[PDB]
Ligand SMILES: [Zn+2]
Ligand SMILES: [Zn+2]
């Protein structure tokens with residue numbers, strides 16, 4: 001051939017996995033309510049309880065981390081400070 | 090000359106009253122002598138501005154400042170107006186230097202002149218004022234006042250620290266580099282709007298790390314130490330992640346070196362230097378395109394992605410093209426070219442078959458938008474007499490049906506010749522400036 | 527941007543690089559001619575000396591290898607001032623480490639030590655010190671490892687103070703070497719002292735391998751005292767840093783972290799997502815996953831069965 005590649009210095013980026021099948025604070029599911037709410041109805045008003053995402057890309061219920069954040073603040077799956085990056089899924 | 094006369098008058102009066110009138114009348118007389126003379130002196134020095142406080146500080150008379158500090162310290166309310174006029178002169182000097190009207194000023198020279206003024210005033214303070222707290226407080230408060238007059242002031246500081254960090258050509262040693270950074274952060278201490286400060290510094294970090302290496306590789310540890318001692322749990326944390334990525338890049342670099350040594354099932358077993366970063370701290374570089382890859386690099390990329398997903402499992406990789414470089418071995422001698430992961434695809438298609446055009450490289454490539462032209466014009470348009478990709482329809486604007494050829498260009502006898510069309514002027518243009526604001 | 531480096535010097539440098547594959551005899555002379563025709567230092571000549579050192583180490587030629595390394599050390603101070611010059615010698619230092627002539631290793635180290643001291647580049651001098659400190663730490667040598675720590679601490683001393691804010695990078699490098707050193711002798715009195723001296727003044731950079739070691743020391747100290755949360759929070763980070771780096775101690779501290787998460791009576795699955803599957807289904811780690819699974823389900827009979835089984 002006329003031109004042949006000898007060296008390459010590509011940069012590889014990566015992102016964490018989440019395993020969205022169950023959160024770790026209550027062990028019910030990523031959706032379908034939490035332990036503090038049980039049923040869909042009974043004063044939910046369109047179910048004001050959604051999924052919250054942190055900077056570390058972990059996902060739990062909004063209320064579950066809220067009870068977590070009052071006592072501790074250290075995102076029990078890593079040692080990031082668990083910023084707030086999203087609300088809902 | 091009055092200050093020498095009043096000091097002599099005070100000295101002769103206190104000497105006479107302590108000798109001709111022993112220890113009897115020394116206190117009331119000297120008190121009157123200091124009071125009215127110093128009141129005259131204070132009004133004399135400030136308004137004279139001819140060997141006056143403004144003038145005698147402008148020309149740099151160390152003795153005049155020194156003898157005045159030792160004279161005005163005796164009577165109260167002397168150092169108060171002394172610093173007030175000193176601050177007023179600093180305000181006048183600051184406004185004449187931070188003047189924004191008029192385009193065509195060198196930002197690196199502007200900070201250098203400002204820092205020279207700070208060093209000059211600090212030298213005067215040490216030599217004359219004997220490190221008085223009141224003088225230090227007034228200049229510190231004043232420096233907080235005339236510096237934040239522009240919303241671009243932290244941006245100008247950020248580019249200056251980028252200029253001082255891109256290469257230490259001025260001050261090859263380290264002793265003055267330590268002082269030049271210490272003065273930089275001291276200047277940064279009396280500055281507000283810290284959020285915009287790192288937002289450009291982080292952009293400067295991206296600009297200095299996503300380009301050619303070999304800038305410091307050691308002074309990075311010094312900046313973060315200064316940021317840690319200056320800030321808390323803030324954008325310095327963004328700088329923390331930036332450093333982690335460099336650590337992971339080299340650890341994976343040697344780890345991949347061991348695995349390419351094992352061989353056995355290596356498909357693309359050629360020279361690779363692959364870096365690993367995290368998206369959590371590097372800002373948006375570009376759209377991260379998904380263009381094609383030449384087959385030999387494809388096998389090389391397939392090894393790393395398979396390997397990085399096996400022994401570094403749990404995380405998947407994403408491919409991108411607006412980053413990196415390469416060394417294309419061409420072949421009367423064998424001179425290796427340079428392609429910044431932009432012209433690899435176009436030149437590889439030429440190797441398969443020459444006599445292509447714009448249609449060929451846009452239809453059988455899955456190429457992204459107009460950014461292709463900027464990469465494409467880097468070899469043909471705006472080229473000096475070192476052209477590695479010539480065309481028959483010589484024109485400025487880009488056509489569709491135009492054929493590409495290659496020229497030997499013996500003038501570029503450089504063995505590892507590089508085409509550094511990118512990074513022509515790192516200047517932080519307005520469109521990114523406004524959106525980041 | 528562009529900048530004319532040099533036309534001829536790069537050509538003959540790479541021409542001799544084509545000659546190193548072709549019977550390195552007379553390639554060294556060609557490299558030497560390039561160095562002679564370079565005169566003042568030389569950027570291409572810096573890499574040429576690096577290549578000559580690499581070639582001479584292949585065919586066991588040490589005498590001029592270190593003499594040219596002294597020239598390489600002097601080349602560090604003037605033209606290639608900060609740059610990748612530390613990356614070059616780190617690769618040179620790692621390339622010398624390939625063989626087992628440990629006497630030549632520390633002759634090469636000690637000559638490096640004094641040369642970097644001259645340029646006030648003690649910045650590059652601790653990097654050699656820590657690599658020698660880590661090497662001594664692996665081989666359980668403390669006679670000269672301590673001398674390195676004392677010299678580094680003295681360099682860290684700001685006369686009146688024994689620790690510097692900007693030199694906090696060297697505090698952690700000193701403490702990390704001391705952390706695993708006293709781990710060998712099980713010195714709890716020193717281990718707590720090292721961690722306490724670390725936490726406050728160290729913070730300039732969480733270097734992943736060093737930060738994980740510092741946290742791993744803290745987790746052992748805290749759990750040896752009784753603080754479950756603090757012992758939690760330390761391995762709670764050490765596993766993060768180890769994962770990024772890739773040291774074999776990733777699973778070692780993860781086992782400690784999983785036990786620490788159990789001890790604090792935590793009601794949250796620690797294996798959920800960061801462990802994912804590589805660190806949740808690793809054979810011995812998966813055995814630990816069954817334990818915390820029984821912990822969640824409060825299966826006392828099953829838990830004790832696994833304890834006796836494994
Ligand atoms: Zn849940
Ligand atoms: Zn709910």
Ligand SMILES: [Zn+2]
Nearest residue numbers: 054056058075
């Ligand atoms: Zn999380």
